[PDB]
């Protein structure tokens, strides 16, 4: 019966991991998994949501990540009749069982959640927090917009920090461009990229003509590791897998 649109990749992962598949009739261009998600209809960028291109899907319920913009179009669409369900956006671990929750309770499915929550604890479990003397620069590159690296206030820097490393970027929140001085005053000591930075990059070797990179221990070591972008910065199901091979990589370096 539902029309579920869902905003937040990892709002809707989320979702078909609830075994709602069948009931989500489009998404947001973050919406990128499970694979049967990039088929259905692009309503838009979660940080730049306009109210038309979601009703044009008729929902019954939207379920939106609270990361997303402009928060007035929510109130907008749901003041024409639908069901508008929020669900958290905190950039932490702990945050997650607080979506599934959300979630669940939304589609009425509270035991299904529930089992999901405690395999997503199992799996962070295992995961080695034990704070090491690591350094780790984040790096966004374009196709066409200057390269960017993360401070903090991000999902990037709590990626990082949960991992049990520490943000070589210090002293602002957001993102910034890339200076030589910069990175090279941060003294990374990883350089930790996304799937598709390396796409916009070309090959290894522009990686490490970033301004400044291989002026720091990482460019001299060609430390490098590159994960999945939502699976990286979503904070959703994967996200315990992505702090292993952030972990693994950092004790690997001991
Ligand atoms: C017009 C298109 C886009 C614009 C203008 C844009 C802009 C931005 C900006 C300025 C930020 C960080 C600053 C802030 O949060 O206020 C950000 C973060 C982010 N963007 Fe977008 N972006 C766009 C498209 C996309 C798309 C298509 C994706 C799909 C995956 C995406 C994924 C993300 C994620 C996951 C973050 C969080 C990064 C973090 O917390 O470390 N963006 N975007
Ligand atoms: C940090 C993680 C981020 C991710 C994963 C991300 C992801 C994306 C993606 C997938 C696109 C679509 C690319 C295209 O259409 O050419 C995009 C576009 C864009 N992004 Fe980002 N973004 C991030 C951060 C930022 C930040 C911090 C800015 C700050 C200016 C930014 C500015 C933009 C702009 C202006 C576009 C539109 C380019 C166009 O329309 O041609 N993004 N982003």
Request: hydrophobic content about 45%.
């Amino acid at each position: 019966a539902e029309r579920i649109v869902t905003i937040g990749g990892d709002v809707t992962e989320i979702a078909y991991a609830l075994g709602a598949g069948d009931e989500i009739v489009a998404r947001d261009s973050t919406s990128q998994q499970p694979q049967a998600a990039q088929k259905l209809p692009d309503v838009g960028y979660m940080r730049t949501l306009n109210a038309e291109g979601i009703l044009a899907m008729k929902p019954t319920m939207l379920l939106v990540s609270e990361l997303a913009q402009p928060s007035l179009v929510l109130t907008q669409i749901a003041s024409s009749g639908v069901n508008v369900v929020t669900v958290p956006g905190q950039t932490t671990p702990e945050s997650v069982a607080m979506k599934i929750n959300a979630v669940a309770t939304a589609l009425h499915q509270t035991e299904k959640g529930q089992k999901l929550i405690e395999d997503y604890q199992q799996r962070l479990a295992a995961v080695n927090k034990t704070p090491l003397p690591v350094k780790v620069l984040f790096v966004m590159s374009h196709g066409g917009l200057t390269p960017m690296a993360a401070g903090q206030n991000t999902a990037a820097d709590a990626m990082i920090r949960a991992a049990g490393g520490s943000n070589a970027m210090q002293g602002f929140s957001r993102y910034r461009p890339l200076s030589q001085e910069g990175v090279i005053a941060s003294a990374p000591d990883l350089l930790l990229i996304t799937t598709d930075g390396v796409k916009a990059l070309g090959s290894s070797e522009n990686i490490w003509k970033l301004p400044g990179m291989a002026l720091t221990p990482a460019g001299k070591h060609k430390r490098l590791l590159v994960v999945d972008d939502m699976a990286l910065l979503g904070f959703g199901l994967e996200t315990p897998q992505v702090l292993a091979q952030l972990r693994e990589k950092m004790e690997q370096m001991q």
